[PDB]
Write a protein that binds this DNA or RNA. Structure first.
Length: 122
RNA sequence: GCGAGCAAUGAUGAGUGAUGGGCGAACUGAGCUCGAAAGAGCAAUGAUGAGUGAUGGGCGAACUGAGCUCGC
């Protein structure tokens, strides 16, 4: 049993999003020090920039956009899933930096359950 | 105060602006959804709001063309 050891972000979202969130926070310490309501908009790029400089439309999502329930679903669900996903990611990044202990099937079950709740709602 | 020089065969005005890429001034911060309705489930370990692309109606918008200069 002491051979099956792994990081959580690789299981909850996988490398295409995990290594992007690390690179857009500059590092994994910095991603673990970030709030859900900034992890939502990491890699929104030109959309975050002009929401500041010109006071434009707030970015609904950043590099999280290609998640398994955002770029492929109705607009009603796209906004609600983005911040819930960023919540569960803000937990997962703090786990993988500060302790490195594995819980990611429960972090998956909670994000199945909150998206099933978004389904009974919408 | 009055005259003098230049000018439609071109007097006047302006040291200031363009195009492209990030960051900073404490994102919202609790509601939502189902139900005859009390109620029930989800939620600060993040509810909700803030998307991109396209379709239709409405609203508004800015070079001049003669003045410039002076001696006592």
């Amino acid at each position: 049993a002491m051979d099956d050891v792994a990081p959580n972000l690789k299981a909850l979202v996988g490398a295409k999003l995990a290594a992007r969130l690390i690179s857009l926070a500059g590092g994994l310490r910095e991603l673990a020090m970030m709030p859900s309501s900034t992890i939502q908009v990491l890699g929104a790029e030109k959309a975050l920039f002009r929401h500041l400089r010109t006071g434009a439309k707030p970015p609904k999502h950043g590099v999280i956009y290609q998640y398994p329930a955002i770029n492929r679903s109705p607009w009603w669900q796209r906004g609600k899933i983005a911040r819930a996903l960023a919540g569960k990611l803000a937990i997962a990044a703090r786990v993988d930096y500060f302790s490195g202990e594995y819980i990611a099937e429960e972090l998956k079950k909670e994000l199945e359950a909150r998206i099933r709740e978004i389904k009974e709602k919408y």
